[PDB]
Design an enzyme around this catalytic site. Structure first.
Site, PDB file in Angstrom:
ATOM      1  N   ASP A  25       5.459 -20.704  -1.001  1.00 27.04           N
ATOM      2  CA  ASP A  25       5.740 -21.406   0.246  1.00 27.04           C
ATOM      3  C   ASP A  25       4.529 -22.125   0.797  1.00 27.04           C
ATOM      4  O   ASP A  25       3.703 -21.515   1.552  1.00 27.04           O
ATOM      5  CB  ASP A  25       6.236 -20.369   1.268  1.00 27.04           C
ATOM      6  CG  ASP A  25       6.779 -21.001   2.531  1.00 27.04           C
ATOM      7  OD1 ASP A  25       6.571 -22.264   2.706  1.00 27.04           O
ATOM      8  OD2 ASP A  25       7.434 -20.300   3.332  1.00 27.04           O
ATOM      9  N   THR A  26       4.358 -23.402   0.488  1.00 27.54           N
ATOM     10  CA  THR A  26       3.165 -24.125   0.946  1.00 27.54           C
ATOM     11  C   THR A  26       3.177 -24.339   2.443  1.00 27.54           C
ATOM     12  O   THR A  26       2.107 -24.651   3.003  1.00 27.54           O
ATOM     13  CB  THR A  26       3.041 -25.509   0.261  1.00 27.54           C
ATOM     14  OG1 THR A  26       4.222 -26.293   0.500  1.00 27.54           O
ATOM     15  CG2 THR A  26       2.867 -25.325  -1.253  1.00 27.54           C
ATOM     16  N   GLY A  27       4.311 -24.204   3.121  1.00 20.72           N
ATOM     17  CA  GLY A  27       4.365 -24.324   4.585  1.00 20.72           C
ATOM     18  C   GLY A  27       4.069 -23.049   5.329  1.00 20.72           C
ATOM     19  O   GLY A  27       4.121 -23.041   6.598  1.00 20.72           O
TER      20      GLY A  27
HETATM   21  C1  GR7 Z   1      17.436 -25.377   5.564  1.00 24.78           C
HETATM   22  O1  GR7 Z   1      16.181 -26.006   5.791  1.00 24.78           O
HETATM   23  C2  GR7 Z   1      15.227 -25.123   6.206  1.00 24.78           C
HETATM   24  C3  GR7 Z   1      13.966 -25.602   6.533  1.00 24.78           C
HETATM   25  C4  GR7 Z   1      12.963 -24.757   6.957  1.00 24.78           C
HETATM   26  C5  GR7 Z   1      13.137 -23.379   7.088  1.00 24.78           C
HETATM   27  C6  GR7 Z   1      14.391 -22.891   6.765  1.00 24.78           C
HETATM   28  C7  GR7 Z   1      15.424 -23.755   6.330  1.00 24.78           C
HETATM   29  C8  GR7 Z   1      14.754 -21.536   6.836  1.00 24.78           C
HETATM   30  O2  GR7 Z   1      14.975 -21.180   5.417  1.00 24.78           O
HETATM   31  C9  GR7 Z   1      15.230 -19.800   5.109  1.00 24.78           C
HETATM   32  C10 GR7 Z   1      14.069 -19.179   4.628  1.00 24.78           C
HETATM   33  C11 GR7 Z   1      13.199 -18.418   5.352  1.00 24.78           C
HETATM   34  C12 GR7 Z   1      12.006 -17.822   5.007  1.00 24.78           C
HETATM   35  C13 GR7 Z   1      10.709 -18.505   5.230  1.00 24.78           C
HETATM   36  C14 GR7 Z   1      10.717 -19.575   6.290  1.00 24.78           C
HETATM   37  C15 GR7 Z   1      11.094 -20.908   5.660  1.00 24.78           C
HETATM   38  N1  GR7 Z   1      10.749 -22.044   6.455  1.00 24.78           N
HETATM   39  C16 GR7 Z   1       9.695 -22.929   6.015  1.00 24.78           C
HETATM   40  C17 GR7 Z   1       8.320 -22.264   6.137  1.00 24.78           C
HETATM   41  O3  GR7 Z   1       7.366 -22.951   5.302  1.00 24.78           O
HETATM   42  C18 GR7 Z   1       7.801 -22.229   7.569  1.00 24.78           C
HETATM   43  C19 GR7 Z   1       7.459 -23.630   8.100  1.00 24.78           C
HETATM   44  C20 GR7 Z   1       6.929 -23.544   9.539  1.00 24.78           C
HETATM   45  C21 GR7 Z   1       5.572 -23.683   9.801  1.00 24.78           C
HETATM   46  C22 GR7 Z   1       5.052 -23.561  11.101  1.00 24.78           C
HETATM   47  C23 GR7 Z   1       5.929 -23.170  12.103  1.00 24.78           C
HETATM   48  C24 GR7 Z   1       7.294 -23.083  11.885  1.00 24.78           C
HETATM   49  C25 GR7 Z   1       7.808 -23.183  10.589  1.00 24.78           C
HETATM   50  N2  GR7 Z   1       6.577 -21.415   7.612  1.00 24.78           N
HETATM   51  C26 GR7 Z   1       6.473 -20.216   8.171  1.00 24.78           C
HETATM   52  O4  GR7 Z   1       7.342 -19.535   8.776  1.00 24.78           O
HETATM   53  O5  GR7 Z   1       5.258 -19.652   8.003  1.00 24.78           O
HETATM   54  C27 GR7 Z   1       5.010 -18.474   8.785  1.00 24.78           C
HETATM   55  C28 GR7 Z   1       4.210 -17.526   7.862  1.00 24.78           C
HETATM   56  O6  GR7 Z   1       2.902 -18.137   7.861  1.00 24.78           O
HETATM   57  C29 GR7 Z   1       2.622 -18.660   9.159  1.00 24.78           C
HETATM   58  O7  GR7 Z   1       2.119 -19.990   9.028  1.00 24.78           O
HETATM   59  C30 GR7 Z   1       3.072 -20.948   9.506  1.00 24.78           C
HETATM   60  C31 GR7 Z   1       3.934 -20.152  10.476  1.00 24.78           C
HETATM   61  C32 GR7 Z   1       3.964 -18.764   9.861  1.00 24.78           C
HETATM   62  S1  GR7 Z   1      11.756 -22.423   7.645  1.00 24.78           S
HETATM   63  O8  GR7 Z   1      10.993 -23.434   8.532  1.00 24.78           O
HETATM   64  O9  GR7 Z   1      12.278 -21.241   8.323  1.00 24.78           O
END
Ligand code: GR7
Ligand code: CL
Ligand code: CL
Ligand code: CL
Ligand code: CL
Ligand code: CL
Ligand code: NA
Lengths: 99, 99
Positions: A25-27
């Protein structure tokens, strides 16, 4: 490997001798794994994801194998919908994004 | 390019005539952008991340320019804390994860 993104980039990880599946997960700044037992002390941490903020348990210096690459670093444990490998351990396995 | 992951992989995008910064996010199935208006039809959707669900507007057939590369696909618009380029558009610019 070179992993395309037409499907979720799921890999096998091994932590505490157990195999699990996790999303590369690069985000994610951080690695977050579903409830499990890990050794040692933990410290508190809040992370803010798409839906809002949650509490997790931060365990440092945990041995974890990711797609056959060895890493040792911070694992957050808490109620994430999917196990995610974030940039703190993607850098340890040498991962880059390319286009 | 090759993007290392020591820092968040942020890039400039152009969407709806607007320049924005967004995260290249292999852990997101879809692209999610902060509230803005877009032309055309939309329908509501719920997406559920860390922290729970948010309600978004789903717009189909939207063109984005991502770090200079054009792509078309679905964009979800809603109260995300960060703009996210998810897999549905990363595939279109040929992005891969390499290690
Ligand atoms: C359908 O299209 C979708 C699009 C996106 C998501 C989902 C469905 C939801 O998809 C289901 C999967 C969930 C599990 C992981 C979350 C996936 N998601 C992407 C993920 O990369 C987020 C992207 C982000 C970044 C910043 C703030 C908010 C969100 N990062 C994140 O939660 O990281 C956390 C752990 O490390 C910390 O650093 C960043 C915040 C924190 S998501 O945003 O819930
Ligand atoms: Cl366990
Ligand atoms: Cl770490
Ligand atoms: Cl707007
Ligand atoms: Cl799409
Ligand atoms: Cl391809
Ligand atoms: Na449309």
């Amino acid at each position: 490997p070179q992993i395309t993104l037409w499907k979720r980039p799921l890999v096998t990880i091994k932590i505490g001798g157990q195999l699990k599946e996790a999303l590369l997960d690069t985000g994610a700044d951080d690695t977050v794994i579903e409830e499990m037992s890990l050794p040692g002390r933990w410290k508190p941490k809040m992370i803010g994801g798409i839906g809002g903020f949650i509490k997790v348990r931060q365990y440092d210096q945990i041995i974890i194998e990711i797609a056959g690459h060895k890493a040792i670093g911070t694992v957050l444990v808490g109620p994430t919908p999917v196990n995610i490998i974030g940039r703190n351990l993607l850098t340890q396995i040498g991962a880059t994004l390319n286009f």
